[PDB]
Amino acid sequence: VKDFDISKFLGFWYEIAFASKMGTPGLAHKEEKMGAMVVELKENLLALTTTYYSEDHCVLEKVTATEGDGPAKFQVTRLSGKKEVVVEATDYLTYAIIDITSLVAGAVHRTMKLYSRSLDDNGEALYNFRKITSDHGFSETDLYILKHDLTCVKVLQSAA
Amino acid sequence: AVVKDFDISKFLGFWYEIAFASKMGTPGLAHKEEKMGAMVVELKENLLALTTTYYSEDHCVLEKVTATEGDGPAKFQVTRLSGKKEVVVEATDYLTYAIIDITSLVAGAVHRTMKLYSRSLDDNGEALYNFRKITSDHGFSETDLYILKHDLTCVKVLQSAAES
Ligand SMILES: CC1=C(/C=C/C(C)=C/C=C/C(C)=C/C(=O)O)C(C)(C)CCC1
Ligand SMILES: CC1=C(/C=C/C(C)=C/C=C/C(C)=C/C(=O)O)C(C)(C)CCC1
Structure with a gap:
């Protein structure tokens, strides 16, 4: 997306589907639980809190992202484990498709x-x-549509 | 029928079950573990012999069953000791897919499944x-749809029972 404006993406987002190779497984173982995300803008950094299911438990992750060479490219530096997240597509109103490349201590992971x-109505x-x-190299076999169990969502609604 | 220039000749063989809707229931789907469902359609004479596989939690079940035509082209009737079913072909491209509507009678649930x-x-x-x-326009919410997990353990048992 070239013309991007983060004011429009602030808030609570529900994670509908993911694609992983990767697955283982993661998420879920058984049963899948749905994921969710809160986007806040904290001191010119994007403060993020996601939830998702991971082998028997709802994980809560709080992270910080610094904007990476314009437009809708962000970077998350974890203990020298980078992630690269790009907004691939968005209608600026109901959905956003995200591309995550992560380096989890050697291991490369490419998630959409x-x-x-x-x-x-998604x-x-x-x-x-x-x-x-499919254009990014994932097959139908790689896509996971999240079951609508809300336990994790509800946990995130409450606080963190 | 709902599609009206249907010929069963076009639909024989192997088919995977990609999704279903039930209300819501739871868981449904399946239970745990979702295991991919499938069907084989055979034309005996005056009868459609269908053999299905699905996960009934402890195992993959193969179930063989018969269907007869029930006036109007795309309409079939199958009777089981559990109840009768009216199945109708709602849509098809005649080449890669078919959307089926099932009005069931299993002992009392006047229910539909698509x-x-x-x-x-x-490429689905x-x-x-x-x-x-x-x-959507038949009364189902996104919550009621079930996109089947690509675990093919029952499917390979179906393929192989039919193969050999
Ligand atoms: C969802 C979402 C967004 C995501 C931002 C970031 C920073 C995502 C990081 C994801 C990671 C880091 C996932 C993982 O590791 O699984 C932005 C604001 C672009 C647009 C609105 C919706
Ligand atoms: C799939 C399929 C077809 C299905 C036929 C029948 C007879 C289906 C019965 C389903 C039941 C009886 C399901 C249940 O009870 O879950 C026909 C040949 C129309 C077109 C090709 C694909």
């Missing part, structure tokens, strides 16, 4: 996800996710 | 898109 402001967004991820 | 069959395991994009639109 579909976030949505809503748990309902069909157009889902169809675009399937076109874009 | 299922998406496909010829293939990839447009079929899935359609399926979401049709299930």
Whole structure:
């Protein structure tokens, strides 16, 4: 996305689907639980709190992202384990498809996800996710549509 | 029928179950573990012999069953000791997929289930898109759709029982 403006993406986002190779497984173992994300802007850094299911438990991760050479490219430096997240597509109103490249201590991981402001009528967004991820080298076998168990969402709604 | 220039000749053989809708229931789907479902369609004479596999938690079940035509082209009737089923073909491109509507009678649940069959395991994009639109205007929420997990353990048992 060239013309990007983060004021528009602040807040609570529901993780609808992900694609991973890768697955182982993671997420879930058984049963899958849905994930979610909170985007805040904290002192010119993007402060982020995600939740997701991981072998028997709902993980909560709080992270910081610094903007990386314009537009919709962000970078998360973990203990010298980088992640690179790019906004691939967005209609600026209901959904955003994200591309994550992470280096988890040697291991490279290439993830794509579909976030949505809503748990309902995500069909157009889902169809675009399937076109874009096949374009990025993922097959149908690599896409996971999250089951609508909300336990983790609810945990994140409450606080952190 | 709902599609009206249907010929079963076009639909014989192997099909994967890609998604279903049930209300819501739871868981449903399946339970745990989702295991991919599938079907073999055989034309005996005056009868459609169908053999299905699905995960009934402890194992993959192969179930063989018969269907007869029930006036109007795309409509079939299958009777089981559990109840009768009216299945109708709602949509098809005649080449890669079919969306089926099942009105069931299993001892009292006047329920419907819609299922998406496909010829293939990839490039189901447009079929899935359609399926979401049709299930939507038939009373189903996104919550009621079940996109099947690509675990193929039952499927390979179906393929192989039919293969050899
Ligand atoms: C969801 C989302 C966004 C994501 C931002 C970041 C920073 C995502 C990081 C993801 C990681 C780091 C995932 C992982 O490791 O699984 C932005 C604000 C672009 C647009 C609105 C929706
Ligand atoms: C899949 C499929 C077809 C299905 C036929 C029948 C007879 C389905 C019965 C389903 C039941 C009886 C399901 C259940 O109870 O879950 C036909 C040949 C129309 C078109 C090609 C794909």
